[PDB]
Design a binder for these strands. Structure first.
Ligand code: NA
Lengths: 133, 132
DNA sequence: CGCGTGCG
DNA sequence: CGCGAATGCG
């Protein structure tokens, strides 16, 4: 049931809350299409939410037909609701990750996109291609 | 275990939310010591909350040694916490019970009192004497 | 660590 | 109907 001609995102975390990075890779080859530099403090869910919206922006910029895959049931919901329901405090330490979540929410509120967001079923398909471990 | 020399309070409720009233009775004699005309819209829990605090002001004014009995676990805890955790919407129609509950909370925030608040154990001792 | 079913 | 407390993957 898996669509190989597609985009897979995943978040690497050094603690949660902790340092967060993410990347988007080709599901078939493994080529890294985009990647973002580690953020000092955020949650895993905030990272997945940014990773999805970033892949959405990358695919729309390119008029792609690739679905986007994520293994985070929570962040897919957040993206579809256009609202990231994170509990993380809002201080100077967390201001970068929150600025990026706010602008991603703003992009979802002002843009259409035809890329379907698909669940990656790990228990069935193995690690998502973009896994960091 | 039952302190017969005490006060019992209870809420009369037609619907919840709905019209709620309450009264304090002497546990032994049944004699009605205070009584609240029906409020148009309230919850039982808020009615109970008010009935306990009414008992406490009633009992403090007369320097009584009576405990207060209530069979509502929720409202007994709300009084101890000085906070009535009702989910009733605040609107014109519910302005009155919220006024009374806000004022009942403010009384608890500002007053000491010595009468203990005890759980009436309906399963072991039958009906609370203030039952409508 | 982060997230979404006794009685008055 | 209103209320209080617990108890699955990245
Ligand atoms: Na009662």
């Amino acid at each position: 049931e898996i669509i190989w001609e597609s985009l897979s995102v995943d978040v690497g975390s050094q603690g949660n809350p902790g340092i967060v990075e993410y990347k988007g890779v080709d599901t078939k080859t493994g080529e890294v299409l985009f990647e973002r530099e580690p953020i000092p403090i955020g949650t895993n869910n905030m990272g997945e939410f940014l990773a999805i919206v970033h892949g959405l922006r990358y695919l729309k910029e390119r008029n792609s037909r690739k679905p986007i895959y994520s293994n985070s049931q929570t962040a897919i919901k957040w993206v579809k609701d256009k609202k990231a329901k994170s509990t993380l405090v809002r201080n100077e330490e967390t201001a970068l990750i929150w600025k990026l979540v706010d602008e991603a929410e703003e992009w979802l509120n002002t843009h259409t996109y035809e890329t379907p967001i698909l669940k990656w079923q790990t228990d069935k398909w193995g690690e998502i291609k973009a896994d960091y471990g």
